[PDB]
C-alpha cells in the first residue's frame, strides 16, 4: 500500500540506482529552471531524493493504483525559483517529451499514475488526466552520457520504498 | 505487445491475484469437465497458470487488438479429457454465460479479442466471431465461494505478464 | 587483457543479469532456429552463459580492443541445428537487426569488436568488417516482453569475466 | 552526443590514460606557463581532468562534428596566470607544434574540431578557424619522459567520458 503524503525513494526494480531533479546533483543555485530533468544517479548507485503523491482525490489516505496523481519531489535544498512538483516538457535537444520539475499542483500537465507491471509497478503521464497515457522510461537521447526519464515507448519497471 | 504462441498470465490491472482453470486448481483426476471455469487465485494473490494467445489470421506473429484470436492454457498437466482451449457455455446453475475450458480451436465459440480499455484492456468474447462482443468481468454467483471470468456488463481491466 | 579463444561471460556493466542464446533458454531440442536471439537472464539474475572470442588476426593471443574479432557461444549442449556463432540478421517483428547465434566463422556478417567505454566496455557490430560500426544494445520492441542485443542507437555498457 | 557546456574526459580509444595540463599534474602554484602542455597520466592510467568544448555558433546546444570549437579545461583549481583555454604555440625546444592551455576564448589560433576517426574520434586543429585543420597525436620528443598532445601527421583516435 502506498500511503498518500509519505515520503517514498522511487527505485528501477532490479537495481539500486535511483533518480534525483537535476537541481539537486548540481547542489549550486540557479537563476532558473527551464527543464529540470530527473536524473539517474549511476556511479556508483545512489538512493536518490524521495518523491510524495498526492492523489486527484483528496480524500484517500492510500494511493489509488491506475488513478490520477501528482508526484512531487521532498527536499529541504533547493536551487531552482521553480516548485519541486512534476510535470512533462517538450524538448528539442531530448526530441519530444521529458519528466522535469517546476509544475503546479492539480495542473492539467500534472498527472501521472501508478500502475502495476509485472510483479512491481510503472509510473505513466496522462495529459490532461485523461487516457491515453504515456509510459514513464528511460532515454538518454540529447542526455549527453545521462539518463534522464521520459515519456517513452518502454515502461520503467519500478519500486517504492519508504524514506530516510 | 502480446506475441502469439507465446505464454502470457491475464492479471487485473491493479491485483496480483491471477487466473487458474478449475480443474488445476483441484489437482485431481476428473471423469468430466462440463464445467470447468476460469477461477482467481485470492488466498493469497497467486500469479496463477498462462495462457496462449492464436490469432485467427494464422500469418500474424503479433496478436492485433479488436480481432478474433483463441486463448489456451499454458499446463502440461490437465486433469479434464476436454481440451485447454477457452470458450464460453450457459450455465443455469451461475445464471447464465461463464468462460470455460474444453473448447476447439477455431470453432464457433471460440473466438475471444483484447481491446483497450483505458490505460490497459479487456477480454471480450464474440459469438461466432462476429459484433456483438460481450466483456469477459468477474462474477461470484454459484462459485461456491470463489470468483470466476464470465461475460458481464462491466469489463474486468486486465494486464498481461510474459511467462516467466 | 581479454584473451583468445578463452570462455568469457559477457555482463552488463552495473547488473549480474548476463545473456544466453534462446534456443539455450528453451531446453528442448528445434526443427530449426531461423533467428535464435541473445536474450537477457532477468527473473533472477542470472550469469548466462559464456563466450569465446576469435579475432580476425589469427595470430593473437590477446584479443585487441577496437578490431574485427568473431564471437561464438559456449557451451556443451546445443538445440540448434546452425552453428553457435554470433551474427546479426533483419527482422520486421523486431522493426530491424537483431544479434543472433547461426553465423558462418569470418563472413562479412561474422565481424563485432570490443571497445572502451567510460570505465568498462561496448560491443559493436561491423558490417564487412569495417566502419561505421553499430552499437549493440539491449531493445524490447517485439520481443513480447523479453530483452534481446541488437545493433541499437544507445551501446550496452558491457564488462567480461572469465568462465565456469 | 556531445553537450555545449559539460564537462567530458578526453581519452585515447583504446586506454585508460587521460590528459591533464602540466599546471595541475605538478599541483604547484607558477611564476608563469608559456608552455603548459596537456600530458597523458600513465604510471598508473588514471581518467586525468575534464575539458568543456564550446562551439563558435553559441546557438548550438549539441557539438557538431566538422566545425570550429574552443576547448577549456574544467578544474576550480588553476596554477598558472594564464586562461584554462586551449591553443597550440611552436616550441623549438619541442620541435614544433604542442598543444597548450593560455589560449584565448575566439582567438585566431583558439579553434579545434572533432572529427570522425573510423569507428571512433579525433581532434584536430584549424589555424584561423579554417582548413587544412592538422590532427592532434600524441608526441615525447623534449617532454622529459611525458607524452604529450601535438598537431602530427598521425591523429590519436579518442573517445570522451561524461564527467563523472
Ligand atoms: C498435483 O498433482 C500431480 C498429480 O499428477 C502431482 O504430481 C505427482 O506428485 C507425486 C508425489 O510427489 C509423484 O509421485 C507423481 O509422479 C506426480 N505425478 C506426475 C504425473 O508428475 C503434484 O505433486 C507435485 O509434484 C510432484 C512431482 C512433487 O514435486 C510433489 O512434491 C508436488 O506436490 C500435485 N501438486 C501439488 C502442488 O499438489
Ligand atoms: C594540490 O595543491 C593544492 C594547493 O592549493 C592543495 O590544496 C591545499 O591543501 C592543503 C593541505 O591539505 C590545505 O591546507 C589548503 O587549504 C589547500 N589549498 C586550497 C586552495 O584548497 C591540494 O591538497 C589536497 O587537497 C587538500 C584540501 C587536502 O585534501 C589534501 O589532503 C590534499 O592533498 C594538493 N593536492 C594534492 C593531491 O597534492
Ligand atoms: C550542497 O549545498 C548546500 C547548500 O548550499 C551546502 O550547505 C552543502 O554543504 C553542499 N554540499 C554537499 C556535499 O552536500
Ligand atoms: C474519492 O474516492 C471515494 C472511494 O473511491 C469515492 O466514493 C469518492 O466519490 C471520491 N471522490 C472524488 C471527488 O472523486
Ligand atoms: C493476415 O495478416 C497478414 C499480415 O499482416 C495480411 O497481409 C493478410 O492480408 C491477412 N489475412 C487476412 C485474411 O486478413
Ligand atoms: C535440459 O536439457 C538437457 C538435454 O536435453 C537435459 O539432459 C537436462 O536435464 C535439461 N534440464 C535442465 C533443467 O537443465
Ligand atoms: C597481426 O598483428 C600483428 C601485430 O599487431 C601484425 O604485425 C600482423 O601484421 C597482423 N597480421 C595480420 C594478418 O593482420
Ligand atoms: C547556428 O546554429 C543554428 C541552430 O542550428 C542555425 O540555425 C544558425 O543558422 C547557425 N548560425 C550560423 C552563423 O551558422
Same mark, same amino acid.
Given at each position: 500500500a502506498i500511503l498518500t503524503g509519505? %515520503? @517514498? @525513494?522511487? +527505485? !528501477?526494480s532490479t537495481s539500486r540506482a535511483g533518480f *534525483? %531533479? &537535476?537541481?539537486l546533483? $548540481?547542489?549550486? /543555485?540557479? %537563476? /532558473?529552471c527551464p527543464l529540470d530533468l530527473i536524473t539517474q544517479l549511476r556511479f556508483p548507485p545512489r538512493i536518490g531524493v524521495p518523491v510524495?503523491?498526492?492523489p486527484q482525490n483528496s480524500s484517500l489516505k492510500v494511493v489509488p493504483l491506475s488513478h490520477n496523481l501528482n =508526484?512531487?519531489?521532498? /527536499? &529541504? +535544498?533547493?536551487?531552482? %525559483?521553480? *516548485? $519541486? =512538483?512534476?510535470?512533462?516538457? /517538450? *524538448?528539442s535537444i531530448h526530441r519530444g517529451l521529458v519528466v522535469t520539475?517546476?509544475?503546479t499542483f492539480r495542473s492539467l500537465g500534472s498527472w501521472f499514475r501508478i500502475e502495476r507491471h509485472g510483479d512491481s509497478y510503472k509510473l505513466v503521464h496522462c495529459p490532461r488526466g485523461s487516457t491515453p497515457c504515456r509510459d514513464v522510461? =528511460?532515454?538518454?537521447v540529447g542526455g549527453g552520457g545521462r539518463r534522464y526519464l521520459a515519456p517513452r515507448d518502454? !515502461? +520503467? #519497471?519500478?519500486?517504492?520504498?519508504? #524514506? *530516510?
Open positions: 509519505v %515520503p @517514498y @525513494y522511487i +527505485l !528501477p *534525483s %531533479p &537535476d537541481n546533483r $548540481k547542489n549550486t /543555485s540557479q %537563476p /532558473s510524495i503523491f498526492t =508526484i512531487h519531489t521532498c /527536499s &529541504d +535544498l533547493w536551487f531552482c %525559483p521553480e *516548485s $519541486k =512538483i512534476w510535470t512533462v516538457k /517538450s *524538448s520539475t517546476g509544475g522510461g =528511460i532515454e538518454t518502454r !515502461p +520503467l #519497471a519500478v519500486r517504492f520504498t519508504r #524514506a *530516510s
